[PDB]
Amino acid sequence: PGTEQYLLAKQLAKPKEKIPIIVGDYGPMWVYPTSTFDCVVADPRKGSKMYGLKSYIEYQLTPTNTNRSVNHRYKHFDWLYERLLVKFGSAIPIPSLPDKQVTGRFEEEFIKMRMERLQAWMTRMCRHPVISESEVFQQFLNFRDEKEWKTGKRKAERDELAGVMIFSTMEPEAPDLDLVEIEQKCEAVGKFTKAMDDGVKELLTVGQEHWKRCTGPLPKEYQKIGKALQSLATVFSSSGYQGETDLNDAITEAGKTYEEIASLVAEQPKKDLHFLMECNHEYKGFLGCFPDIIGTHKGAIEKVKESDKLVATSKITLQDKQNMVKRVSIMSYALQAEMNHFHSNRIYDYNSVIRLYLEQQVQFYETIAEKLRQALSRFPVM
Template identity: 25%
Template structure:
């Protein structure tokens, strides 16, 4: 099965004869000015019965991919939703940027198609096959639901902000106990934080190396130009050798430029992509933390309601309030059960995702390093070939000055004086006439 996190070609999720292949192609600029954007064609080939056709295509823009990512995070909490490429303000319509984004969007869908749970989401299937009107209707429905739950959403957001800034005092025994899953998650968090630091260092130094290689390519071009001009000032065989050296340096400049392009696409880009993957891993861990906090709050609420019901029980004249309190306790117990089920489900999913992430990260890093090593070997061979082709030219230059001058072309004699017109005065005769002492010499 393809790695969820690796892979750069068309998305292929296949198992036991099930096939789902997704590619992203044909980026096209739409509109002009501030309303301009790039559209992409998303092509799908599948034999899965849940899709209406075996082969189909839709047009999507970057904001559609963002919408899909958001819905998957809500629909399958605790899963590692693959990262998307970042937004860009400057140069977002350049050919290089558009192609890079196309590759990363395709990788996003590749990873989704390889994920057992995410590829089963209704939002993923809707994204792949709905027409424009269907996608717009789905977005409008989601927006309406969000506005309908606006009050609850703001309360949930308040809880999230509060729990991220302070420690919750949890009175319930369930919240106080640390389960084996909690200990395992703490280990994962420490591992991810350290990995993020180390991956950041690798990405930073990789970018520095790419920059130096670009400078090397420019330097080789200038170096070759200088030797070519120098060769034009000499004579053979030195002229030929120097010109050949200039040509070799120019070819090396092209090789280094090509190598930088390959390393950028197959090494630098995957390194930064994995930093984004770590962000997706941390988002999955945060989803578990939110469900754990929700369970803690439900437990605290239940404890408070039990205390109130116990306080009202048996008090004369407060029978109605006591009955309401008991009813509230029953509801709170149901809330705790619901919150615990949700937390346990998300917690189990996060642990599965972490195990899968570690396993596939090792495979992906191995593949990336192997690809990089193979690129270096091939590049070194091509560079060596250029130098080997130059060597016979340099060896042909004689180290004897006599040989050099013997091979040099003879000096060009000065041009003869221009012919004198008939009847013109002879300068030599004029000189003799003007100097009588020279007469008869």
């Protein structure tokens, strides 16, 4: 494995792009820029390059930093995703991008929900203290013409400071950690991410079940009650009896009210549940990256756990053993700084989306109650 390269590398290799890690008040963290920018993904429009009419959708990117816009076709984002995974993937979870829908990819349904999840993906990256400060990300947003875009697309594709070698560009400003503490930190992360992954999968499951229920069978029930009340009122209207127009009208409206409720019920998920599910979908994406990041860290600890045997059988020197110990310590610091970034955002994201979901639900039931109250006020008293 290349993991050995990093731990045993001749290394005297002074880095170009340095990534600092510091110990704040509660654990090792990344260094956050005073000014945090975001990027707007919008204004989709067709593009060309001597093609014809197999025109491709090309989105516009406007960082709220310098408000200077550049364009990018989907393929370009996929390209950045791969470069980020290659370069930072062993240390930072890189949420994957959406896929290819149905071959009608040229209107609202497609390019809008896409421009939707692409916007979320770009925001995460823009807000990441390491990713957003990388050359490949900076140059992806700030290039003036096909000359820069092509030159930047080359040095990035050829940056061998990737995989596990990324840790060699990190400089933790704290003491070295002993192997015991390192192994436990790694084990704890492995355990938490796995538990949450299950917890997140469970929520996404009941979610879709309740979704297919609010758009299928439930709306049909209020629908049946409402037509049943109308059929009845219609029969009543033909009784020939007097002074009934009063009631029958109220009954016909109550039936129509239940129909409006059926439709409101079928359209509610898009206002609340939808968001809860998206947040969880994105988190499964993040959590899906940990099995490999933990594998890399675990693999590193194993190698170091053999350094003594290696020094004993003279396979390596005493200096080399310490370099391994020093380097694996840095990996631990990166894992903890990323885990800190993750927890911080997890708390904020779940607090927001659950508040949002609850607020919408409250509004939903109050609205149903108001509609029922209106139908009631139309019934004569006795």
